[model samples]
Target: GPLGSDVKDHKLLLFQEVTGLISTWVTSIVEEADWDFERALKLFIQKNADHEIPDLAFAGSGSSLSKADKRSLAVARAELVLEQIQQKANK
Candidate 1:
């Protein structure tokens, strides 16, 4: 069966936030991590930091949002998640 919509949406958002990778790449990474957001983010950061993700991963499209509006929305969501994760790590 295909991945469920809600879970895939969240994973896609998180992966996009941290890596700035396009949708296709984000989906692949999330699947590779078995849909675990943190694990996918962790691997993305490490591999991307090491310059492993490559240019093609950045190829994709978008939405009901104008480009600028969508980016700003993503930025806010990304920041919120980052803060949440950091707080969890602090415990």
Candidate 2:
């Protein structure tokens, strides 16, 4: 099957990188609808990072990942980011 056919009906996962400081701003923007620029700036380490949640499943003819497989991969990606941050901070 062609690549387009395999994913024609599937949605693409999207993610954005945010600095730790900007993350605080993002949280405040959601929880308080206010921007805390100074706090965000202060917390924004040069190395902090994060990713958006990924789709946990996919479907196609002849080949597909089980629910558990998809979930595990998604979780692993998140864990990988957390581990990277931890390692960076520890350094």
Candidate 3:
């Protein structure tokens, strides 16, 4: 459920990140994806961090969550979903 409306903004944000420019709105795009918190974070990292430029730029975003923080949140979110599936199976 990606936000097609924000596609342009998303592309711009990616460009900014890849260029190592910190913008006030990069994290905002990350926050607004239709995906759940963890999936959103994971997708952002996967898509944006595939290159060294984007990876370093993401690291420099000055957000409360560091790159590691983003990764940890993604893991936690996925774990929660897995636990829910397991619980349902047990029921």
Candidate 4:
């Protein structure tokens, strides 16, 4: 427990780096396209010749959002609950 807690700040910083990037990407899609989610995702899913990404993986990477959020998916709902629990506990 102590060892895990020891570098918590570093972990938070690293995690936040990812979170910030994620938040920015989501904000860009939701806001820039004026909440036309499919249009935003269509722009998102446009192919590059070298791309091997899964359709759902790419779009649904952020799927564990709020229940009201379109991004949420059934497969990710359990994870969403777990994440929220951990987040609350961490606080």
Candidate 5:
């Protein structure tokens, strides 16, 4: 075994900070010029959030489509949040 790899400093992350970063990641899709992948993440969803199908927002084929779209966006945003956290953690 070799000790060539440098050791990283471990630091405790605050819940508020982590969540706040998550908020920005989410906002990127909801309110910013987000990526196409982010547009379909679940993180940008809400009850009847889409005007296309407001009534019974969580029921039917359209609803299923909506859920999938939102879930996709969530995954995309989560990546950004995780990357930021990893960068912070690494330092």
Candidate 6:
């Protein structure tokens, strides 16, 4: 096997830090973006801003709340976080 496949791990860590999402869901989104952090993050933020990320992505966190409520909260939180990132990038 080649020793050239740990990039996703780094991206996973970074993604989790930036998005504060569970590992499982982070992995899902990263994979969705083909392991591209920028794409994954942009897609995540845009989708979340529109409140379209599926509830299944929030499962297993045991955050203790109705699924819909938690998703709504997550959407708002991600929206704010992504706004900051965009602001910094625009600077």
lDDT of 4 by residue, 1-91 (tens): 8786555445333322322224445455435555543343443333211242233332334446543242234224424444666698799
lDDT of 4 at 34: 52
Task: Name the regions of candidate 2 deviating beyond 4 angstroms.
Answer: 1-63
RMSD for all candidates, in order, please. Answer: 6.0, 14.0, 9.2, 13.7, 14.0, 3.6
Q: What tens digits encode model 3's per-residue C-alpha lDDT throughout 1-91?
A: 4787587566545434332334543455345664244444444455544642243433353557676565455445545555666698799
Show where candidate 5 strays beyond 4 Å. Answer: 1-65
Colliding pairs, model 4: none
Report, for all candidates in order, the number of backbone clashes: 0, 0, 0, 0, 10, 0
lDDT of 2 by residue, 1-91 (tens): 7886444222111111222112333343223322333232222221122323223222223557665464454345545565666698899
| Candidate 6 TM-score, true structure as reference | 0.59
lDDT of prediction 3 = 0.48
What is the C-alpha lDDT profile of model 1 across 1-91, one tens digit per residue? Answer: 3657876788688677665668877877788888887677666656655766665565336534554454445445545666788899999
What 10-residue stretch in candidate 5 is worst by lDDT? Answer: 7-16
Highest TM-score among the candidates is held by which one? Answer: 6
The global Cα lDDT (0 to 1) of model 6 is 0.72
Candidate 3: clashing pairs of residues: none
Best-matching candidate per lDDT: 6
List candidate 1 stretches off by more than 4 Å.
Answer: 1-3, 59-86, 89-91
In model 5, what is the error at residue 8, expressed in angstroms?
A: 29
* Regions more than 4 Å wrong, model 4: 1-21, 47-91
> Where is model 1 poorest over a 10-residue stretch in terms of lDDT?
63-72
